[model samples]
Target: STGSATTTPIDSLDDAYITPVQIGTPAQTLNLDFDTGSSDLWVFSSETTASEVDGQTIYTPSKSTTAKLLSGATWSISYGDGSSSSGDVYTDTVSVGGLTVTGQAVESAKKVSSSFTEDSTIDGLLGLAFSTLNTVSPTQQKTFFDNAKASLDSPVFTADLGYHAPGTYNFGFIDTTAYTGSITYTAVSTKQGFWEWTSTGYAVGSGTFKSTSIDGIADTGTTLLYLPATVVSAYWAQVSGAKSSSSVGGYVFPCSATLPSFTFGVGSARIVIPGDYIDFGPISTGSSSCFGGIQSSAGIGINIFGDVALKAAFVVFNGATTPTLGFASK
Candidate 1:
């Protein structure tokens, strides 16, 4: 139960964001969130001017007495939601259980927020995904996989997001020991950065497909799952009085009592989308009208499978080692 931070590679003066994970320990000991949308692994720093830092958790290196900053780098990032942060980079020892990455970079946002500033609660972020998504693009941005690759007792990392509850995030070196080996597999295509697939067909409630399939890519970065017109028309037909209505910015339909659980088959795997999530979140650009689902990309040539679909599976992005992706056993 001892935590140690390392600063061993003492020569380069660069900064990084320290993400906490249970890499060298057991599942019961460490839990962390893995985000791909943004690439900075951040922590509140003691050197930070608290008033300027705003609502983030401030790291007291004075207490740790080991945090150090790099001389020439500065960080400022803004999200699609209009949130931003400005920070300086530093090198510090970072440890979790028995593993340590020396000269680990850390970002201390001096000024955090333009929108989320008042709501900062997370101590830091753990970014793991494709290189295109990293905030430290100009320089070397080492992801959890990049730094921990050599140490992972098992060379693989698996993520389960089905349970989206507080404290549900978990990370670590994969342990093949507990696996039943009942995994359903799919080969990944490297040319596309997003996880893509050729659907067997659409199934409205249960695992039945309507004798047709649509081609699309699955993206963790995007927040919505965009579909084609034929599929949209078929889907709306299944919903009660599923007639279309014009929204301020999108095509939307809502009849609280008429939703149903649905499934879509990608090859042999059937992905079940919960009924409650059908018209779940607010459709942006479509006014504040609550949408179960929308129809618009009907005419757009490109189709996207966003967060709404990815949440249904356990994702193992193999880009770090293999040009592939894997879905975990339920």
Candidate 2:
């Protein structure tokens, strides 16, 4: 039988979509952020310190008949935003929608940063990136998809994300009805354990296309689009009164500024982001200054085609031999 599942977003906060998953024998449900940028199935659990748990739901492995602690094994991770988690490991039955993977490694957080504790909505992160990126210590662990790949008719998944709306993360198979037109394919380089690719070029508004290639990762966990400093500056330059503001922490422009659409090359096709999407709400509450969704990838070593750029299309994360990416209009 083919293994597949569909998940719905729990909240639209910063486009952080959550998927429900059941773990252990009694099947404790947890709302997890399905992150494609990192690999580690870490969660808020009974092991978490009382002060760190906050209002988030905790998974109690002790109550699960099938949960087995992996003594001496541990995991730790830190996100780009500085949020971090560290915990011990356990093995148990983990299910996503109707699909199940037995003996899946489940990391139970014993320590969490204020960022994780304050975000009461998300219980943890379920990484969908390559297993090579898993942060387990002693012995590295495989992701749920990696362990269940052989059971799938086609080792593939699709992410359909929308702005302030519900979206899905379909596992094992692709849903043709989810997207329109032909799916443009591009070879991905997993050297960095991310869905890394090169954009042939990009254009601001309806301007002529330039052949400036950009190497970036397709990260669903990230909220905004990040590109090279020069490319970022060029896009905001087209908007009247736009400037990099220290007060705003990024490029900010007049809230009423007439912004232009930005387009990026993907294989032979292009993904265009409209003006309204670029004009992310006010930079600060009660402020007339608005922030640009596209910002510089300064500090971060690589550019990121995050949710801001992804929500414009249907994305197929093909885990085939070469791991190609397919995109189409929704």
Candidate 3:
């Protein structure tokens, strides 16, 4: 839990932001996706078949003296998307931003979904979510934060994300200079193993505020923002030529439309998402229609303030006995 920050590695072709982390002795650097939505630190490794290796830089425990097999341990996880992975487990030295945690449970992948194999930008995912969601069987293991909690000054971390510019992940201490105005904190519910919190309300463009409570998870791993059908439709309605097409999969609109900003409240603070951010990108190669980053979470059963929303502000994940989430304009 050393007070340090690491540069955020952005691979936004499809918004798989990654960060460099070291595992085992002699430090094998892997570009890992730091996900707060799921809890399992699995990586492509030597245990995986050669055919499934693809372009990922696999983590090799065999070469590290500190690495030990967690005998009989196995883990399998399926994401909100169809992507899934399963593997054996190991314990080894893991470090992020020079903060070290020994004997951290590391899942070594034996098999992965073709979707992950096709994605060359991400080697694996390091879950920053609660330890309760860890998928390991036989012995439940703690998350990196849980393991580092004892050594931390304050059990907390902050996320600062940007579109083109570099961002940082600061541990233990919030970087006051990274944000503007003041931080707005709200209670967090660790139920179902997520950093879930409620927004005070929301508004679309210059429209009137809808003072309704909205529950959502502060998910860095997710690429887009998802809200309730009413909220999503409200936002999409502000943009001309926007439609929810079954073929396009969600909300899409003309790139030239007057896309309005989205605003969500945290306590009394308002976080405004710019119009350009909501525009996302073109639906396909040389297409005039573009996807909207804000979409409905109707069937998903939960709302997610993913990268699209998180990048609009600096977020604090406080790991107090009673946890909380804070947001600040940057």
Candidate 4:
């Protein structure tokens, strides 16, 4: 874990807020962000005016028979990336995985604009990583995981990004099976709000790179494992056809049939991310493409273990155990 662990961003109050239980009715089937740093659930609505919805996903709660709105209150939110949404505040029943939460705070987005729309396009977002950053009032918001943690068969939930598969998101307690038994466990940091861990360092083909041993954060929010440009270049040296291609950007090599597998190490636990993930696709830059494992986030400091890394390991976020995270081989 040479890079910093990824975390659910804390409440900016303006954007990253939370709405615990958001009930999307048949008419108003809303996609929401399950976040803990902030508390509040909001959706784009039919009642919204054109000025508010410039760039955002709006949910017409009127579509759902079950959807109900509070009498009155203003609701608006902003994200770390400088995007924002606003609407009237309302209360309604919200559910996740069939679990229901009554009178959950919801912000019906009538207006939105920001960079988030360009980067991530969807009806809404669901945040399940941490709880300390919740932005909504405790009485008004309840997290999906907070509501589901007790009854789940497993305290662990994993988001598996299949081979050549689309990305996915998951929530609830985690259930550790054989994978948990295989890897050594390391305790998480005592700090609240995000998931953080200490990495024994990252390995290319053999043991981890000789120089970059450090602590890191595991973020479900980010997409790639950001690393030092020089370190990334060194790791590519091990891959058979891997090379640098300016046209393809990042690292590039011939997308040869015999591309080597790149492995990462955490304690005694080692996870391998297939070559397809590194290159983004099978064919790139004619025939050769760079191995996608180590990407170049040149200016962004702090290496991040993004979705690709998460796919390689089983993450057990055990809040029930009191501010701790567990890791196991998958």
Candidate 5:
């Protein structure tokens, strides 16, 4: 009833994490992104636009004897960046690690954004967020996690993302040996279909911790940590030569600037983000300006605790009777 899967960090920046999933009869394995920020388990398939099949793998429904069309069903999802994907639906056997879900809705992409086409490493995304956020119309689909939750021994899953290292996603139970110190549990709001929770406060480097409550979500699909403008400004201010540069986008700083670590509170527990994670990478191939992993949440309605913050700690997406979130130092 429980399953566990390990994820591989893709790209030099470790921008995306890919988990292989077995789908249909004989199991056509594909590397799918375990996106906690979304709900549709979409994938590049035989139905996907031919030209859009760059270096990615395609799931061929005709090849899977067990695959059946979800008649009259269709799904569409769009990202804030204007990139999007739309597709028809099919139900088939899908398995992650050892956990298997029969007749699971699998969205077959008919078209995809150029951005997704270019990201050859990611075949598609397996949304881990609440099923309420699923994009399927006429007949809404449930996420893989939702279908497996009831059968899970603990009705929860934990995320252990590492910086440039292979991490694991455990279902139905916790890996006691994966984290250090004590695991702190916090109340989460299932509102808007995200694992939404508010952090007690944050601190810039060794500076005193702030007790101000900041609301945000724990998104595994996101790449950076975005906070309120005030919090972001304070963090960047501690680093010399840091500025919100339009030229490079977001916040950028001189490569040589001394970066300070960031700390966020989970009750009495403190999760510290080392300075190197904040430094991110250069603005361009050889540019002396580096992009910061922490940025202002001005345009983005809610703050996001993305991989930059998640990789700094062990996060648990509790899907129990009342959804809750847990954080612990690794």
Candidate 6:
């Protein structure tokens, strides 16, 4: 069987994608961030301190007939973006699109960081990463995908994130209509609990491709592209008004400046990111300066091919064996 979920952009920020998920027995619907970079299904719930939750819809387990508390179990997670959440655990029915998982481990947050509490549109995070990375105590939990894989026609999922638009995440099957040309495949090395892969090289715009080996993860949860510091500097150097802004926390450029396209090598294939996509919108609504969607991965340790890079192509996460990546032009 197959299932499909539509993802909507949040606040023109292009920062996150939200998918509607039905949780518990009576089916409390929550708009969750489908995060591949993390492995925890957490929600703002009744267990969360009321003061910690602002406009978020909290999941009330007591109202669901099928909700079962996993006594003595707890979970906590800190994201690369610095947001964190923690709380107790419960087993409940969780469904995304048309696929449903019975007894899916749900982490109910008792505490949330300011970053999460301020984001009212997002009610929770649905982890699509491997179950081995789950953080539940007493017993590790399995991800919704892992629990539903055996029943799926194929162990695979595809992410089609659009620019300032809605996209679809498909499971168990690939919709050929979503992409054009043949999908080039690459082997994924997942020892780091991520869809880690190596790029043969890269080029700033249409410049010559350097054989710079870059190891990184394909993280849909992250908003921008992160690479080595030197690479980031080189990219910004090409733009006339670009500057490294301590205030913005990344590279920022005048909105009127012309931008260069970016290209990354994958084995023999090259996926190019358009110049416009690199302009991640204004630093503030009324500001004439915009932040670069690509930045340095200095502190994070690994390069992250975030939404800015992923939206440039159609990506296939093949879960069958060894976990492969297939990319094609959209």
Q: Say which candidate scores most in lDDT.
A: 5
Q: How many pairs of residues collide in each model?
A: 11, 0, 0, 62, 0, 0
Residue 77 CA displacement from its true place in model 5, Å: 0.3
TM-score for all models, in order of appearance: 0.66, 0.95, 0.97, 0.68, 0.98, 0.97
**Model 1 per-residue lDDT tens digits across residues 17-89:** 2234432111111222245445565555555556655555556544444556566767666754365666777
Write model 2 residue lDDT over 174-262, tens digit each, in one string.
Answer: 78898888889888999999999888889999998888789998888887899999998889889889999777678888988888989
Error at 202, model 1, angstroms:
3.5
lDDT of 6 by residue, 1-330 (tens): 788999999877678889999999799999998888888999999988888889998899999999999999999898888888999999999888999889999999999999998999999999888788899997999888888888889999889998889999998998999988889989888798888888888899879988978999988889999999999998999999899999888899999988999998878888899888898778988899988988999988899999998988899988886789889888
Best by TM-score: 5
Candidate 3 worst ten-residue window by lDDT: 5-14
Candidate 1 vs 6: which has more TM-score:
6
Please list the C-alpha lDDT of all candidates, in the order they appear. Answer: 0.51, 0.86, 0.89, 0.53, 0.92, 0.90
**Weakest 10 consecutive residues, lDDT, candidate 5?**
275-284
**Candidate 2 wrong stretches, greater than 4 Å:** 1-13
| Global Cα lDDT for candidate 1 | 0.51
Model 4 residue 181 distance off true place after TM-score fit, in angstroms? 5.1
| lDDT for model 5 | 0.92
Residue 136 in candidate 3, Cα distance off native in Å:
0.1
- What does each candidate score in C-alpha RMSD? 8.6, 1.7, 1.2, 7.8, 0.9, 1.2
Instruction: Please give the lDDT score at residue 157 for candidate 3.
Output: 86
Better structure of 3 and 4 per TM-score: 3
Candidates sorted on TM-score, descending: 5, 3, 6, 2, 4, 1
